[PDB]
Design a binder for this molecule. Structure first.
Ligand SMILES: CCCCCCCCCCCCO[C@@H]1O[C@H](CO)[C@@H](O[C@H]2O[C@H](CO)[C@@H](O)[C@H](O)[C@H]2O)[C@H](O)[C@H]1O
Ligand SMILES: Brc1ccc([C@@H]2CCNC[C@H]2COc2ccc3c(c2)OCO3)cc1
Ligand SMILES: *[C@@H]1O[C@H](CO)[C@@H](O)[C@H](O)[C@H]1NC(C)=O
Ligand SMILES: *[C@@H]1O[C@H](CO)[C@@H](O)[C@H](O)[C@H]1NC(C)=O
Lengths: 117, 541, 106
């Protein structure tokens, strides 16, 4: 009943940029956070950043200062992630998760961003 | 024969200690100590204290003790070209007393509302909150929503301030009768405690500046034994050596220590203007500086032990719960930290009274400086009755703060705290320091210190007064003039016109000094160099 | 930052028996630990937060205990669909970090 849509697969030349989408439906999008996770080919999960729908804030990870710029489009309940200055190893599967303020868990996830390089 | 002397030697010491302690070392110092380098903040703090606070303090104390005058007319015996520094100090202190008294109003309203077996901000179920309630955790079965807020948060933003009624800084809504009567009572208290002078100030500080210490001590005793107190001290002492590489940590430490010692404000002059002729001012300045530093340190421990207790009872990482900077840290977070503990009534009462008196003593010091400076500047028609012209400045400051008592006064008081203080006071302090250090003659000042105490200071104090402190002050003001800040409060951003008005207010006090040297030429006709050579050297005593 | 290490990826316990797995935390945490599942190829799903409070919508088979440094993720006699990977998450500090995870063989 609460489904979240994203983009699909894209094989892109190294050095280009990709804009990831994240649809929200089922729960009030303007009530919980919108984070992203970085997971390599069958490897561990790694947090990317944080997004607030009210003011478009971003408390990014110190290890991803410029690797990903994050914006939010509250009109379409969507939040983009400007992925610039990409390399080969940064072609990892990502997710769009809902998260309430300070229990910090991820209730509902997406379908996986099969980004190939 | 027109001057006076304190009752004893401890009275002036306690008065200057009370001037050196405010809400700064209570909330701004620990948040800075955590955010700006963690436990590794103390070393740059001590460095900037030795190099930026103690020199200014010693210099102003010695000059005020020798010359025996305020901060307006004291340049007639030092360097009359910078007499506008006095009026700049007067209007600066007017701004400061107008924005500061609102904090004491908030605190005393909290006090008068904290007389009930059940604190009105413990449970959200009242006749003012909304459906966005979220009780204190006590469990892990609740999902906190971005729109959801703590009960004390909505209490502070909906009952004591009514801030949601404010639709922006363009409008004000209306004055609150509660806070109006509260600040009127506090103003009457200030006047009836400041009417006579230092003879009553030295007696009222005995309970005004000493009572906060016992409250802080009992709060430390309560906090340092609760389960979770260790995490607080660990976070307060966990260093981060990478932070000191960035200039931001150093300039923030410099600003914190300069605002905690608060020199260049024109009150040390008035205080030392009543001290004995040859009292050990060096010992006085050193003791006051070390007492202020130790007070800031123990207050950091006091706040962070209860912050760690709350972070263990709630979720951890105090950095997240210590989100905002300002009085909201005490009025919301520490408020819940006190309310959720047993014996909440008495503890909240003593904490509110401690904050109240930590505001009152600083207000007393500032108003003393102002009235003494103006009485020394205009002793012809005034200075015969001291009870007059004090009601004048008190009523003026009350009617000025009236604009802050509105339902949306938090934004304007934070603006006045952020822009009207820093740049104006820093330029005034650096200018008076370079005046009493480069124009009056540092060799003359050292000979004067010798004539007063009995031994001239070493070359270290000389180079600190001539080289270290001026470079320190100009470095601070240049760092502040390097990054224009865009601050916010309670999900509300500040528009650009608000920034322009803050710049104007923060500059309407530095433009106060050139008009004096401009009027110096019209009334006294002649060549420019004559007036320059007449205003660079002092006249007869 | 915050590193949450645990056993290797191959080391696990087969079906029918009790399966207890821990995840070593760098610093000390009160209860801010959470576990997840992810079938190979699919998206990770939430299991339990606060290391003891199961989220609404999971069967009673799942269990969570342990606090401070040692956190027990106890499962026993998995079904034909409980087989998945299990990482350890926390809520201590920004940036939050996950763990290595462990398989479930057989
Ligand atoms: C030469 C004469 C004067 C010319 C005019 C000067 C006008 C200056 C206008 C205001 C300039 C900036 O004003 C100043 O900004 C700084 C930087 O954020 C604020 O500083 C604030 O944020 C900084 C961030 O680093 C913290 O370290 C600091 O503790 C805090 O107070 C000061 O509180 C404010 O006083
Ligand atoms: Br910037 C600046 C510079 C110095 C200070 C000192 C230093 C710390 N201890 C209290 C504080 C005194 O602040 C005042 C309060 C009420 C007043 C007043 C001044 O003058 C009129 O009434 C604060 C801000
Ligand atoms: C919580 O506050 C928001 C602020 O806009 C408001 O829209 C919402 O209706 C509030 N919640 C309830 C239950 O009224
Ligand atoms: C909280 O949730 C847990 C699920 O792990 C449940 O056992 C407990 O009874 C709940 N407490 C409540 C609803 O008060």
């Amino acid at each position: 009943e609460v489904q979240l849509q994203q983009s699909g697969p894209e094989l892109v030349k190294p050095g280009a940029s990709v804009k990831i989408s994240c649809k929200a439906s089922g729960y009030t999008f303007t009530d919980y956070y919108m984070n992203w996770v970085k997971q390599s080919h069958g490897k561990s999960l790694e947090w990317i950043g944080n997004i607030n729908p009210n003011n478009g804030g971003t408390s990014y990870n110190q290890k991803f200062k410029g690797k990903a710029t994050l914006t939010v489009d509250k009109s379409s309940t969507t939040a983009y992630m400007e992925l610039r200055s990409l390399t080969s190893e940064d072609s990892a599967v990502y997710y769009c998760t809902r998260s309430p303020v300070r229990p910090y868990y991820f209730d509902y996830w997406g379908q996986g961003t099969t980004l190939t390089v | 024969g027109e001057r006076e002397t304190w009752g004893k030697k401890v009275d002036f010491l306690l008065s200057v200690i009370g001037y050196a302690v405010d809400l700064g070392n209570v909330w701004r110092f620990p948040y800075i100590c955590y955010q700006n380098g963690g436990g590794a903040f103390l070393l740059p703090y001590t460095i900037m204290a030795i190099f930026g606070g103690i020199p200014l303090f010693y210099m102003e104390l010695a000059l005020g003790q020798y010359h025996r005058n305020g901060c307006i007319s004291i340049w007639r015996k030092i360097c009359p070209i910078f007499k506008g520094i006095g009026y700049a100090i007067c209007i600066i202190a007017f701004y400061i007393a107008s924005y500061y008294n609102t904090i004491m109003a908030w605190a005393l309203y909290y006090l008068i509302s904290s007389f009930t077996d059940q604190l009105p901000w413990t449970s959200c179920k009242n006749s003012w909150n909304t459906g966005n309630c979220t009780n204190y955790f006590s469990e892990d079965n609740i999902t906190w929503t971005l729109h959801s807020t703590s009960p004390a948060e909505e209490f502070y933003t909906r009952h004591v301030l009514q801030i949601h009624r404010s639709k922006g800084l363009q409008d004000l809504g209306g004055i609150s009768w509660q806070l109006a009567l509260c600040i009127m009572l506090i103003f009457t208290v200030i006047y009836f405690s400041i009417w006579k002078g230092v003879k009553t100030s030295g007696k009222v500080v005995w309970v005004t500046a000493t009572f906060p210490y016992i409250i802080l001590s009992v709060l430390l005793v309560r906090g340092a034994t609760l389960p979770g107190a260790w995490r607080g001290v660990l976070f307060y002492l966990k260093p981060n050596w990478q932070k000191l590489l960035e200039t931001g940590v150093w300039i923030d430490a410099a600003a914190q220590i300069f605002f905690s010692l608060g020199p260049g404000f024109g009150v040390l002059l008035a205080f030392a203007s009543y001290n004995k002729f040859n009292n050990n001012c060096y010992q006085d300045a050193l003791v006051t500086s070390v007492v202020n530093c130790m007070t800031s340190f123990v207050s950091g421990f006091v706040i962070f032990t209860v912050l760690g207790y709350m972070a263990e009872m709630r979720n951890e990482d105090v950095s997240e719960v210590a989100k905002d900077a300002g009085p909201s840290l005490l009025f919301i977070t520490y408020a819940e930290a006190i309310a959720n503990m047993p014996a909440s009534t008495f503890f909240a009462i003593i904490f509110f009274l401690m904050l109240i008196t930590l505001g009152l003593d600083s207000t007393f010091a500032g108003l003393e400086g102002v009235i003494t400076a103006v009485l020394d500047e205009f002793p012809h028609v005034w200075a015969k009755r001291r009870e007059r012209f004090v009601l004048a400045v008190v009523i003026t400051c009350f009617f000025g703060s009236l604009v802050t008592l509105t339902f949306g006064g938090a934004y304007v008081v934070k603006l006045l705290e952020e822009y009207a203080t820093g740049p104006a006071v820093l330029t005034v302090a650096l200018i008076e320091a370079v005046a009493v250090s480069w124009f009056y003659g540092i060799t003359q000042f050292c000979r004067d210190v010798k004539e007063m105490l009995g031994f001239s200071p070493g070359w270290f104090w000389r180079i600190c007064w001539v080289a270290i402190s001026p470079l320190f002050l100009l470095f601070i003001i240049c760092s502040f003039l390097m990054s224009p800040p865009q601050l916010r409060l309670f999900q509300y951003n500040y528009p650009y016109w608000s920034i322009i008005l803050g710049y104007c207010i923060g500059t309407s006090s530095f433009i106060c000094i050139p008009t004096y040297i401009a009027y110096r030429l019209i009334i006294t006709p002649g060549t420019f160099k004559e007036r320059i050579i007449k205003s660079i050297t002092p006249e007869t005593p | 930052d915050i590193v949450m290490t645990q056993s290797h990826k191959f080391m696990s316990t087969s079906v029918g028996d009790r399966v207890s797995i821990t995840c070593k935390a760098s610093q000390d945490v009160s209860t801010a630990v959470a576990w997840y599942q992810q079938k190979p190829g699919q998206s990770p799903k939430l299991l339990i937060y606060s290391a003891s409070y199961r989220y609404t919508g999971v069967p009673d088979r799942f269990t969570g205990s342990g606090s401070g440094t040692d956190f027990t993720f106890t499962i026993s006699s998995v079904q034909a669909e409980d087989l998945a990977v299990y990482y350890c998450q926390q809520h201590y500090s920004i940036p939050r970090t996950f763990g290595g995870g462990t398989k479930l063989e057989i």
